[PDB]
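Retro notes
What went well: the complex prediction finally ran end to end.
Inputs used:
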Amino acid sequence: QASDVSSNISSLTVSPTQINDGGKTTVRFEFDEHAQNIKAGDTITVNWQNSGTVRGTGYTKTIKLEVQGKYVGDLVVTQDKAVVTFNDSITGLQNITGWGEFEIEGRNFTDTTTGNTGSFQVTSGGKTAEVTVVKSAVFYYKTGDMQTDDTNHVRWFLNINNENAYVDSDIRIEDDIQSGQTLDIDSFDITVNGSESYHGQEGINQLAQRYGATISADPASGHISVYIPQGYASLNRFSIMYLTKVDNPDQKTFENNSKAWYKENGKDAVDGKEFNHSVANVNAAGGVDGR
Amino acid sequence: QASDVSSNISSLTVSPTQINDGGKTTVRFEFDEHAQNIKAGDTITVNWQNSGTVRGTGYTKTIKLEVQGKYVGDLVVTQDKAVVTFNDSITGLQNITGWGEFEIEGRNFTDTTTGNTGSFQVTSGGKTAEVTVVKSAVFYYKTGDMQTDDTNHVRWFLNINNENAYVDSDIRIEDDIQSGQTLDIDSFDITVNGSESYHGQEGINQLAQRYGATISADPASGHISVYIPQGYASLNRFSIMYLTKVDNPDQKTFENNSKAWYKENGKDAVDGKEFNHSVANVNAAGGVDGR
């Protein structure tokens, strides 16, 4: 309405301008009072296409904005847009200038088995930017991500017997979660063959006494142990999912280390090979100045 | 000689006065200048019987002694005796008073299958004390101790299949070392059936590729994992020994937690039962005053 002062945007950039599917771009914006004065309740909005085949999803964050220590408003990044709102303490400040930085995930849902290049638009005030998102055409790995709607946790996956192979042996995983994060035991979700789901302690207990498969975890040490007896492991597929809570919000990367022991039918035993994964942290930042 | 001023001992106590075999007593002594003045090089010695059937072994420590910050000598506790020695900075100090505290392990090696009560003598200057030491007449447990000659480490033992039973399953141990101490990987010593010894990384590697038994450890997290395949576990006995380095010298107790999974022949599976152990820390302390 009359309280949108996005016209005050002086600069709008995205970096990179082109990303792999599931990658992220950093949006940087600057603003001043070149179009009109900023007052309490005014808002400055960065939009991006968030609803179609090629879209952006913001990494959710709320940052307090200060001028020389004084709290004058906030930067709220949601999945659909980023909004700067000025509080009643902005009153009286002259020559107002500001900046924000935040992160958007790009996704390309185009259904071709080929490569596909498409783009989503980012817009603020007088400025537009295009982000191009390119979609590209093992017994065990570990992976992880930060969900756009949950930037204070890392989601981790122990993906076991992914081709439902015959298994000669038991399967053993030994997992050390690296520093700056804490296991949430209640977060455990184990899906077998994409049909059964076991949740939290009760689920871990179900898996155990039903099929002798044992997940044991120590959140103080960050250790998780996985044992699957040969009988239940053979031809079965396991996705062991869990969250860590972020303890160090300024850390750049969260790491999770595992070692695995298993013997696939008609193959040599794997004997404590390392399967590690890093997840990049996300941020938002911003500042106001004036007199 | 002329430089022994143990006659200056004013007080000598042991607490407890009677202990179980392998337990400890706290020796407390006070001294002044009632027999003669204390000068540089003079020594005050607490002796104890250290060589027979019932004996004491001191918990080795060296403490700096200060009067109002000034370093004036040391308390050296060895396995055989405790000695206070005054340095050249004691010169000029008047009305010298002091105290020491340290710990002795009592042992009773008497070869009777019965109970046996015996005693060792502690002596300093004019004072004597007697410590009485009383000797009393599972598939898996964990235990530990502080060696009298190595008070900056805790020695830990994972004692597995202690009666050389038939084993239905693999054996799995998951061990979390508690805070204030760090695993020394090079310290691993695994004895099988009291005949073979495997030392450090090379030994762990021998056990692995020879008999498929895997010890995996993470000193940063304090986690140790033990896997013994059913084939090598059955009728075999394992003592897995390792050291932690003490990181917090004033901590009262060091703890080590384990959980075990195994099925003894003709018994029900044990499924993550806890087998924890605490080791009491040892100390020595002392002070000098004067003007």
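What we learned: Chain A touches chain B through 19 residues (CB under 8 Å).
What to try next: split runs per interface for comparison.
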